[PDB]
């Protein structure tokens, strides 16, 4: 049964530590992680207009 | 998106835990393999999550982390690459190796040195896994030869 | 601390029967054709009298070969002749001296000419002359 | 500075002054301590280099290189202990004194402030080394290693003192390197070649070209017990760095004739490593490594254009350890089995299991796996020496092949079944066997974490 | 050298002393206590100082009129330039 | 090798390379007598040159028709997983260097070992000196009298007699 | 190159005789091997392994492929005799597999 | 953070949602889950010290040198006056390395920021970038004397060739 | 490659299209065949050889793809009709070996 | 030793566990059922047919 | 190719007077095992064939050497020869590459390294 | 791990040797001396080890042929090869 903290001592120690090194971080580096653009589709401001 | 990258590295930092904790962690006894074999299982479902995050919005990532030496002009630090070859393959290369060790677990079952077999099968997966993920051309060459020795 | 006359001295004919075997028996009778002869092409200081060379080649073969050990493991007392290339060399194959590989490696070299052509599927060959026209020939519109 | 020479000379009567057998542990204890002083005021700049006295700037220079020199001393008494325990104490008091008497000058040199303290201290060894080779040899061929070790080193280093006294009175004063701020060039003549050739060839005869290395395996094959001074003579050689102080300046503009030192050592680099494959004596087998990827620096130094000094410095202290440590293995495995013939020892790796991973990490750093210092010391060589001319990629690209078959054949020779006749080889590597064999791989790989502390100014 | 003593260096006692005098002096006081020193040791080769000052000064020119990375030969017409 | 038994070394291998050529288990079996027919065709005749043509021409028609990648009987002079297990190899006389507290285990076995040595402690005085009597000068293959005339202890003790097992 | 077309598609043939050979000597002929054969396939630490792959085999090819942003344009107009020309070869591979076996 | 105009970047353009569909989305069972097993052990601790750190505030200053020393003075053989005329020149060659670093990373922000176009956008960095380094190795790079760095002795004697050749020998100018 | 005149902006990887890149075009049918809006063509993320014909059409394909995320199928008729846009284009481009065949023969 | 749980065979052809083969055979369906949708609905080629571009006019 | 290697040859019956080719070896393996089996040894064996293996190989040539046969003056075809060649290859380059660096510019302007 | 004993080897060898219709299965098994059933010089000694390899299957060394006089001798050393009875 438990044996419920072994998976917790396994994963849940790092997941804490690793993100504490990020939330306090991404805005520290002038250019950190490079994530790309949204790739917008004509579902926002646009008409189609075809369909042709 | 904040959890987007951070979960990848989980896959990466995890597999180093099976090594560090081989030297006075108060090691799990024989069935030390099971210590690893489960240490795998959660890595795949860990990698399964970001697969879906990408097949929605795209948005691949890299990381800027840690500055190794900076010579004259070119500044090499290190990074990782989340690219289209990274998102799909990596779950696969772990998914098979999820099933592979069980087989050995039966095949090698009688070998007294089994305990350090799974170590020299473990680094192999680790460093072959950093070849697919690196965008810094030098960094491609750390695991390029890191595997070429593992064959020996 | 072997005292006198450790190794080869100025051969390769200093009373051929005096050497093998005084000590270092390469030949039994001073003629086994193991007599400390093989100073072939001398004046090269290489391999003096040497209870030694040209004894034959291609391997110790490492098989049953079991008086005691006899080849590469177990070290019979003293035969040693020349060595050190013997752990990366073996004996006779089934065929002999057929280079059909330079044939096959050049087998595709026949298809070098198959390189100078193209493979364009559509349309067919349709023997032509001036029908080729990869892009355009005559007027645009 | 005197922070260093004074305690290390203060060492000198820390030894005999002591009692019976306490001597070894007495001096090994202190000799480690000085390493705190070693770093202590050092690893300051950096930029606009440190000079703290008139005739000493200890090392500023970004050629730190001195911290190692102070390591290898209390690695000897752990190394040298084996068969030196079998003769008298008043002689054992000597062998620790002259061994220090070496360590005192290598602190003097590498600082020297100038050219002319370098030389008289550049030749000031060979008094302490020559005495360790001839006595406490093993074979009787040693007596010739005594001569050959001179009559080269001293043979052509006299033309220094003809040249360096020729500069002193020609342009100003050589009293100080840190003033070159007036240097005229060297254009050409049939006189100036000689000047450049006199100010050079003395250094080559130490770090060998493929000619005139005829001494190097003569002295190492047959040489003291532990490699006791054989670890030191792998410091001495690389200490020909001073060519970095000259050829940067002081006839800068003759590269005209460089080519006979390029194509002569550049085709030997592909060469003498290959004459190392069939060797039947193990302490020979390592001695020819030491030529090879040492002699690569001589094509790093002559070429100007840093990214070579980025990579030329890391090499002087690259094999500074790896090439050191191998002479420490082949010693130990020789304690137990008294032949140095490589064949004889086989069927190990069953009987000494822990010493398995010791061979491996050694023979792996000639392979130069990417992360360690070794490659990051070679791949700044290839990047500039490629730009020289594109064709250098071939030969020095071959070097990266034959060296791999080179190393393995030494390990894989010790993986075999052999039980054979040996009743010896019982000792399962008592701690000193594995203690002194460490304090190499621990400090070596470690530096890769912050490897900006091994670099030149460029 | 085994009369079933354990032993490391030489004999009964200070051998036991001789192990703690190498292990402890050798590392944990140097390979660790010392290694700490250079780990966070202060800015090496004045680069730390350089990042910011080679950072600030970029925009200063870029802001008002000035170009970026001149290489104008350090204010000519300070030099008479011998022709022949 | 004595001229009599020289066909055996061929007669051993002859059918050997055969079976790796045939596939069905009967195929080997069906060609047995059929190819066995050729041996005794001349069953009794000269030992010398007359029948040396049974040795002479045996060379060809064998080497011709050789190397269809034979079945190698895996643990043997060659072929896969033959010498495979060396990770034990049983380094007999591992019992020297211990530092007991490693010797607490197998007390009954440490008792037994020192009981074997008494034989090899002194068996020699008549064991070695008999070899000075047994072989007069240049003797060929070197084993002692098979008994050693009363009790061999071992005599070949113990290197051949206690030697290493396989697992 | 108008050779690989000749060359590659011929290799596609042997893809049959690759398989069928090691199938027909192992899975087909009469039992041949020495007696005392202990075979036991009831092996929780094995059967657990295969079962995952073959399940994660069949469904795999379609799941992976079905979800992608399309990165290119395949021709999609494939005339006759260019069509099953691979399958056309394997069809007789199995023929020449068994007939030659 | 940093200085905006030292590290400019284009704005965010957050994508619009498009549910469109009757089917459950699992991310909303994760971003609503993952957030609750993160913030508590994480954000509370950063807030924990950042007030714990209110107890003491150190200082380290912004180091700015004093520039009298000029360039091409002084009388030739001199030491004192030409010791410094490198200290001007040496630091100002350690700067001009890094200004190539900063301008280079800004380039990367032209790619993975976009990466699909890679061509029809950014208008600036590349067409600027190769107008930067071509303002670098000329006169600021002593080559092949870069081994000696040949400070101020060879530093001008490119720039004598950049004077005694250009602008006069150009024929006719 | 219809209008061969210069490019105001020099951006290659033809961010300068002739106007919009065709495969070849026109020559006559269709003189102006008409594609989609370039301002929206590279405003989205659109790979090269996604700038051929049927840009208007395939931009909608992914629209619904992003709609139902936990789904393996959006429109198998559109993806079918994606040929019916493309197949119709490609077959319309199978005609350039028909004209040049009989046009470059005798006359 | 370990246990007797199965004895070997003299070529009496050992028996199966009877849950060995059935539990497997359910995976003989997953190829024969998952082959269902091949021809339904897809043909040898789902393409459209090139109509011989006759209009060279 | 390398080699026959003569797994059959002439024989029978000549040279059956050749015996005691084994008596040579049989003496030793008797004596060697007479050496190798003893209770108290703990040490390696002389094994002279190895002593005469290196010492008749590494040393004991320049003593045996004579500078006479012109197959020992061969080495000029080996030692010096290609070392001239590598000069001929290089010195043409480093020049052909140099001439262009002056008249005409091969490189780009984003090469600062070098 | 497979259990091995000294009985089967007395049986198996007795077995197939009793399978051959060339030998009546009233004849001696453990000791016939095999010279009564050696006929002829060949086609016995190497003939009998042709089948016995088909069950165990290690190599049947050549020089061990002349040990095959005693039917207890063949079974004798097969114990020493495969690590058989105590
Ligand atoms: C540092 C670099 C570590 C990664 C490379 C080493 C690989 C792991 C290893 O040592 O295998 C030993 C293993 C020993 O084999 P063995 O001869 O059969 O074992 C004989 C003895 O048991 C002796 O061999 P061993 O296998 O028992 O090794 C001893 C080890 C065994 O016990 C362990 O803890 C396992 C160590 C593995 C990780 C070590 C720390 C990783 C960080 O015990 C210790 O670790 C002592 C504690 C040291 C803690 C150090 C903390 C930092 C200082 O394999 C090797 O000899 C080769 C190792 C090199 C692998 C390739 C490296 C390049 C890739
Ligand atoms: C029993 C528990 C009681 C409570 C214990 C207290 C809590 C636990 C201990 C505290 C946690 C320490 C963790 C250290 C590793 C992580 C540190 C980190 O990631 O953040 C940086 C953190 C400080 O962050 P920061 O203050 O914001 O950075 C200021 C500078 O800008 C920094 O920038 P930088 O320019 O200096 O670059 C840093 C970089 C470069 O520094 C280096 O490490 C290179 C070292 C090479 C030395 C070369 C000379 C060799 C001759 O460091 C590294 O490469 C990472 C190496 C990991 C530690 C190095 C170990 C050296 C031995 O730590 C450090 O950078 C200083 C570490 C100095 C070495 C400490 C060695 C401690 C050894 C204790 C071992 C514990 C036993 C474990 C038992 C289990 C065994 C199975
Ligand atoms: C060989 C001997 C030939 C040496 C030629 C004479 C050397 C010489 O003349 O030096 C040239 C020059 C000093 O002479 P000078 O030209 O008059 O200087 C102008 C002063 N206003 O400039 C100099 O001062 C150079 C003087 C130092 C040169 C000394 C070394 C020359 C030979 C070194 C050989 C290198 C190693 C060979 C020997 C090792 C084996 C024994």
UniProtKB/Swiss-Prot annotation, chain B:
S-S pairs: none
Species this protein is from: Bos taurus (Bovine)
Function according to Swiss-Prot or TrEMBL: Core subunit of the mitochondrial membrane respiratory chain NADH dehydrogenase (Complex I) which catalyzes electron transfer from NADH through the respiratory chain, using ubiquinone as an electron acceptor. Essential for the catalytic activity and assembly of complex I.
Residues that bear N-formylmethionine: 1
Span within the parent record: 1 to 152 of 606
Subunit record text: Core subunit of respiratory chain NADH dehydrogenase (Complex I) which is composed of 45 different subunits.
Protein family per UniProt: Belongs to the complex I subunit 5 family.
Designated gene of the protein: MT-ND5
Source superkingdom: Eukaryota
Protein name: NADH-ubiquinone oxidoreductase chain 5
Transmembrane intervals: 4-24, 43-63, 87-107, 117-137, 140-152
Subcellular location: Mitochondrion inner membrane
From Swiss-Prot, chain E:
Major subcellular site: mitochondrion
Localization, UniProt: Mitochondrion inner membrane
Keyword presence, NADP: no
Source organism, top-level taxon: Eukaryota
Keyword Oxidoreductase: no
Record's bilayer topology term: Single-pass membrane protein
Keywords: Electron transport, Membrane, Mitochondrion, Mitochondrion inner membrane, Respiratory chain, Transit peptide, Transmembrane, Transmembrane helix, Transport
Transmembrane segments annotated in the record for this chain: 21-41
Signal peptide span: none
GO cellular component terms, semicolon-separated: mitochondrial inner membrane; mitochondrion; respiratory chain complex I
Biased composition (Basic and acidic residues): 1-9
Role, per record: Accessory subunit of the mitochondrial membrane respiratory chain NADH dehydrogenase (Complex I), that is believed not to be involved in catalysis. Complex I functions in the transfer of electrons from NADH to the respiratory chain. The immediate electron acceptor for the enzyme is believed to be ubiquinone.
The family this protein is said to belong to: Belongs to the complex I NDUFB11 subunit family.
Subunit details: Complex I is composed of 45 different subunits. Interacts with BCAP31.
Protein name (database record): NADH dehydrogenase [ubiquinone] 1 beta subcomplex subunit 11, mitochondrial
Organism of derivation: Bos taurus (Bovine)
Curated annotation (Swiss-Prot), chain F:
Superkingdom of the organism of origin: Eukaryota
Major place of residence: mitochondrion
Keyword Transcription on entry: no
Region spans: Disordered: 130-151
A family per Pfam: Complex1_LYR
Known function: Accessory subunit of the mitochondrial membrane respiratory chain NADH dehydrogenase (Complex I), that is believed to be not involved in catalysis. Complex I functions in the transfer of electrons from NADH to the respiratory chain. The immediate electron acceptor for the enzyme is believed to be ubiquinone.
Membership in a protein family: Belongs to the complex I LYR family.
Subunit-level organization: Mammalian complex I is composed of 45 different subunits.
Protein name according to UniProt: NADH dehydrogenase [ubiquinone] 1 beta subcomplex subunit 9
Organism per entry: Bos taurus
Swiss-Prot record, chain H:
Positions bearing Phosphoserine: 148
UniProt keyword annotation of Transport present: yes
Keyword annotations: Electron transport, Membrane, Mitochondrion, Mitochondrion inner membrane, Phosphoprotein, Respiratory chain, Transport
Subcellular compartments: Mitochondrion inner membrane
The keyword Phosphoprotein appears for this protein: yes
GO cellular component: mitochondrial inner membrane; mitochondrion; respiratory chain complex I
InterPro entries for this protein: NADH_UbQ_OxRdtase_su10, NDUFB10
Domain of life of the organism encoding this protein: Eukaryota
Membrane topology term: Peripheral membrane protein
Region described as Disordered: 1-24
Compositional bias segments (type: Basic and acidic residues): 1-12
Predominant location: mitochondrion
Subunit structure: Complex I is composed of 45 different subunits. Interacts with CHCHD4.
Function: Accessory subunit that is involved in the functional assembly of the mitochondrial respiratory chain complex I. Complex I has an NADH dehydrogenase activity with ubiquinone as an immediate electron acceptor and mediates the transfer of electrons from NADH to the respiratory chain.
Protein family: Belongs to the complex I NDUFB10 subunit family.
Protein name: NADH dehydrogenase [ubiquinone] 1 beta subcomplex subunit 10
Organism: Bos taurus
């Amino acid at each position: 049964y438990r044996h419920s903290i072994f998976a917790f001592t396994h994963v849940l120690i790092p997941v804490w530590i690793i993100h504490y090194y990020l939330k306090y971080h991404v805005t520290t580096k002038p250019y950190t992680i490079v994530e790309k653009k949204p790739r917008i589709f004509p579902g926002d401001t646009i008409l189609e207009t075809g369909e042709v | 998106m904040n959890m987007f990258s951070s979960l990848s590295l989980v896959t990466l930092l995890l597999l180093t835990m099976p090594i560090m904790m081989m030297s006075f962690n108060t090691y799990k006894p024989s069935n030390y393999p099971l210590y690893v074999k489960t240490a795998i299982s959660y890595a795949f479902i860990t990698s399964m999550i970001p697969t879906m995050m990408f097949i929605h919005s795209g948005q691949e990532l890299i990381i800027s982390n840690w500055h190794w030496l900076t010579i004259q002009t070119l500044k090499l630090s290190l990074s990782f690459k989340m690219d289209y070859f990274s998102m799909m393959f990596i779950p696969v290369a772990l998914f098979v190796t999820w099933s592979i060790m069980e087989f050995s677990m039966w095949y090698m079952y009688s070998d007294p040195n089994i305990n350090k077999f799974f170590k020299y099968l473990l680094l192999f997966l680790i460093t072959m896994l950093i070849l697919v993920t690196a965008n810094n051309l030098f960094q491609l060459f750390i695991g390029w030869e890191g595997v070429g020795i593992m064959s020996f | 601390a072997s005292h006198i006359t450790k190794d080869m001295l100025p051969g390769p004919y200093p009373k051929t029967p005096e050497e093998r075997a005084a000590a270092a028996k390469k030949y039994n009778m001073r003629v086994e054709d193991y007599e400390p002869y093989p100073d072939d092409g001398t004046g090269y200081g290489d391999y003096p009298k040497l209870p030694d060379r040209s004894q034959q080649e291609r391997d110790p073969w490492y098989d049953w070969d079991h008086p005691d050990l006899r080849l590469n493991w177990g070290e019979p007392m003293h035969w040693d002749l020349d060595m050190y290339i013997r752990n990366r060399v073996d004996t006779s194959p089934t065929p002999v001296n057929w280079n059909l590989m330079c044939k096959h490696l050049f087998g595709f070299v026949a298809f070098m000419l198959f390189m100078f052509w193209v493979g364009e599927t559509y349309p067919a060959y349709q023997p032509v002359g001036p029908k080729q026209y990869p892009y355009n020939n005559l007027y645009l519109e | 500075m005197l922070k260093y020479i004074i305690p290390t000379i203060m060492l000198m009567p820390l030894t005999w002054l002591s009692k019976n057998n306490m001597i070894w542990v007495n001096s090994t204890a202190h000799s480690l301590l000085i390493s705190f002083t070693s770093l202590l005021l050092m690893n300051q700049f950096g930029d606009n280099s440190l000079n703290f006295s008139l005739l000493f700037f200890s090392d500023s220079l970004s050629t730190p290189l001195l911290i190692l020199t102070m390591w290898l001393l209390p690695l000897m008494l752990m190394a040298s202990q084996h068969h030196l325990s079998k003769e008298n104490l008043t002689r054992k008091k000597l062998f620790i004194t002259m061994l220090i008497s070496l360590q005192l000058f290598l602190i003097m040199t590498f600082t020297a402030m100038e050219l002319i303290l370098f030389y008289i201290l550049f030749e000031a060894t060979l008094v302490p080394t020559l005495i360790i080779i001839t006595r406490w040899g093993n074979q009787t061929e040693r007596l010739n290693a005594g001569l050959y070790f001179l009559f080269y080193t001293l043979a052509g280093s006299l033309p220094l003192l003809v040249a360096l006294i020729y500069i002193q009175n020609t342009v100003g004063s050589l009293n100080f390197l840190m003033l070159q701020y007036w240097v005229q060039p060297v254009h050409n003549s049939w006189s100036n070649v000689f000047m450049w050739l006199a100010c050079m060839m003395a250094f080559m005869v130490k770090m060998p070209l493929y000619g005139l290395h005829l001494w190097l395996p003569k002295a190492h094959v047959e040489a003291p017990i532990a490699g006791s001074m054989v670890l030191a003579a792998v410091l001495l050689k690389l200490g020909g760095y001073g060519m970095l102080r000259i050829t940067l300046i002081l006839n800068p503009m003759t590269d005209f004739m460089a080519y006979p030192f390029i194509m002569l050592s550049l085709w030997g680099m592909i060469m003498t490593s290959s004459i190392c494959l069939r060797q039947t004596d193990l302490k020979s087998l390592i001695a020819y490594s030491s030529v090879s990827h040492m002699a690569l620096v001589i094509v790093a130094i002559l070429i100007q254009t840093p990214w070579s000094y980025m990579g030329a410095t890391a090499l002087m202290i690259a094999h500074g350890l790896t090439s050191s440590m191998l002479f420490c293995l082949a010693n130990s495995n020789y304690e137990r089995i008294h032949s140095r013939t490589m064949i004889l020892a086989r069927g190990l790796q069953t009987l000494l299991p822990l010493m398995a991973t010791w061979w491996l990490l050694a023979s792996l750093t000639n392979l130069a796996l990417p992360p360690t210092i070794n490659l990051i010391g070679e791949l700044f060589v290839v990047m500039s020496t490629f730009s020289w001319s594109n064709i250098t990629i071939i030969l020095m690209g071959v070097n990266m092949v034959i060296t791999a078959l080179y190393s393995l054949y030494m390990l894989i020779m010790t993986q075999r079944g052999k039980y054979t006749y040996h009743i010896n080889n019982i000792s399962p590597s008592f701690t000193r066997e594995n203690a002194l064999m460490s304090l190499h791989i621990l400090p070596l790989l470690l530096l890769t974490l912050n490897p900006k502390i091994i670099l030149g100014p460029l | 050298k085994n009369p079933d003593s354990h032993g490391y260096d030489k004999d009964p006692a200070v051998d036991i002393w001789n192990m703690r005098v190498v292990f402890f002096f050798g590392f944990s006081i140097v390979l660790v206590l010392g290694s700490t020193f250079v780990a966070y040791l202060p800015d090496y080769r004045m680069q730390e100082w350089a990042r910011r000052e080679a950072e600030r000064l970029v925009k200063y020119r870029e802001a008002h009129g000035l170009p970026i990375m001149e290489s104008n030969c350090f204010d000519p017409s300070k030099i008479q330039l011998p022709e022949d | 090798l004595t001229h009599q038994q020289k066909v055996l070394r061929l007669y051993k291998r002859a059918l050997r390379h055969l079976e790796s050529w045939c596939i069905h288990r009967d195929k080997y079996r069906y060609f047995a007598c059929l190819l066995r027919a050729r041996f005794d065709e001349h069953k009794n005749e000269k030992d010398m040159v007359k029948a040396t043509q049974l040795l002479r021409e045996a060379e060809e028609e064998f080497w011709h028709g050789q190397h269809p990648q034979p079945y190698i009987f895996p643990e043997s002079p060659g072929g896969t997983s033959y010498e495979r297990y060396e990770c034990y190899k049983v380094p007999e006389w591992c019992l020297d260097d211990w530092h007991p507290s490693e010797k607490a285990m197998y007390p009954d076995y440490f008792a037994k070992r020192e009981q074997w040595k008494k034989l090899r402690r002194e068996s020699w005085e008549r064991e070695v000196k008999q070899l000075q009597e047994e072989t007069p000068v240049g003797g060929p293959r070197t084993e002692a009298l098979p008994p050693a005339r009363k009790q061999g202890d071992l005599p070949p003790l113990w290197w051949h007699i206690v030697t290493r097992p396989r697992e | 190159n108008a050779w690989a077309l000749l060359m590659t598609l011929i290799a596609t043939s042997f893809t049959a005789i690759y398989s069928t050979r090691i199938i027909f000597f192992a899975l087909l002929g009469q039992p041949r091997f020495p007696t005392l054969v202990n075979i036991n396939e009831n092996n929780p630490l094995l059967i657990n392994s295969i079962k995952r792959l073959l399940i994660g085999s069949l469904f795999a090819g379609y799941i992976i492929s079905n979800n992608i942003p399309p990165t290119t344009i395949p021709q999609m107009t494939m005339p006759y005799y260019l069509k099953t020309t691979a399958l056309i070869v394997t069809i007789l591979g199995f023929i020449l597999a068994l007939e030659i076996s | 953070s940093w200085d905006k105009d030292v590290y400019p970047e284009p704005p965010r353009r957050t994508p619009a949602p498009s549910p469109q569909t009757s089917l459950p989305n699992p991310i909303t069972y994760l971003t609503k889950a993952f957030d609750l097993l993160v913030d508590r052990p994480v954000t509370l601790v950063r807030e924990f010290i950042e007030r714990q750190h209110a107890k003491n505030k150190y200082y380290y200053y912004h180091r700015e040198f004093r520039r009298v020393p000029d360039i091409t003075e002084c009388q030739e053989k001199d030491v004192l006056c030409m010791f410094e005329a490198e200290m001007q020149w040496r630091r100002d060659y350690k700067v001009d390395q890094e200004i190539v670093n900063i301008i280079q990373e800004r380039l990367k922000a032209c790619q993975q920021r976009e990466g699909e176009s890679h061509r029809q956008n950014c208008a600036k960095e590349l067409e600027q970038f190769t107008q930067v380094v071509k303002a670098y190795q000329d006169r600021y790079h002593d080559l092949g004397a870069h081994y000696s760095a040949r400070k101020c002795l060879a530093k001008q004697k490119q720039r004598m060739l950049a004077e005694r050749k250009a602008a006069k020998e150009a024929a006719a100018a | 490659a219809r209008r061969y005149l210069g490019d105001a902006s020099v951006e290659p990887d033809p961010l300068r299209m002739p106007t919009f890149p065709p495969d070849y075009g026109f020559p006559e049918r269709k003189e102006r065949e008409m594609v989609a809006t370039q301002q929206e063509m590279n405003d989205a993320q659109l790979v090269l050889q996604q700038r051929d014909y049927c840009a208007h059409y395939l931009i909608r394909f992914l629209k619904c793809k992003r709609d139902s995320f936990p789904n393996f199928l959006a429109c198998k008729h559109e993806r079918h009709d994606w040929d019916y846009c493309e197949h119709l284009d490609y077959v319309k481009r199978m005609k350039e070996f028909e004209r040049e065949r009989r046009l470059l023969q005798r006359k | 030793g370990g246990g007797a749980h199965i004895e070997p065979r003299y070529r009496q052809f050992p028996q199966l566990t009877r849950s060995q083969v059935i539990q497997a055979e359910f995976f003989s369906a997953t190829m024969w059922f998952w082959i269902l949708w091949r021809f339904w609905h897809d043909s040898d080629a789902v393409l459209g047919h090139f109509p011989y571009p006759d209009p060279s006019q | 190719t390398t080699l026959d290697p003569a797994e059959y040859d002439i024989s029978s019956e000549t040279r059956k007077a050749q015996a005691e080719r084994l008596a040579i070896r049989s003496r030793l393996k008797r004596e060697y095992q007479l050496q190798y089996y003893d209770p108290s040894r703990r040490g390696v064996i002389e094994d002279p064939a190895l002593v005469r293996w290196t010492y008749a190989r590494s040393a004991n040539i320049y003593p045996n050497f004579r500078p006479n046969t012109k197959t020992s003056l061969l080495g000029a075809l080996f030692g010096i020869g290609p070392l001239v060649f590598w000069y001929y290859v290089f010195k043409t380059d480093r020049d052909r590459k140099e001439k262009l660096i002056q008249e005409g510019k091969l490189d780009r302007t984003f090469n600062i390294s070098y | 791990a497979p259990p091995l004993t000294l009985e089967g080897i007395k049986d198996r060898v007795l077995y197939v040797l009793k399978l051959y219709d060339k030998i009546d299965p009233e004849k001696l098994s453990v000791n016939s001396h095999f010279m009564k059933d050696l006929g002829l010089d060949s086609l016995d000694q190497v003939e009998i080890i042709m089948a016995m390899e088909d069950e165990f299957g290690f190599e049947i060394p050549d020089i061990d042929a002349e040990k095959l006089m005693c039917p207890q001798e063949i079974v004798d050393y097969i114990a020493d090869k495969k690590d058989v009875y105590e």
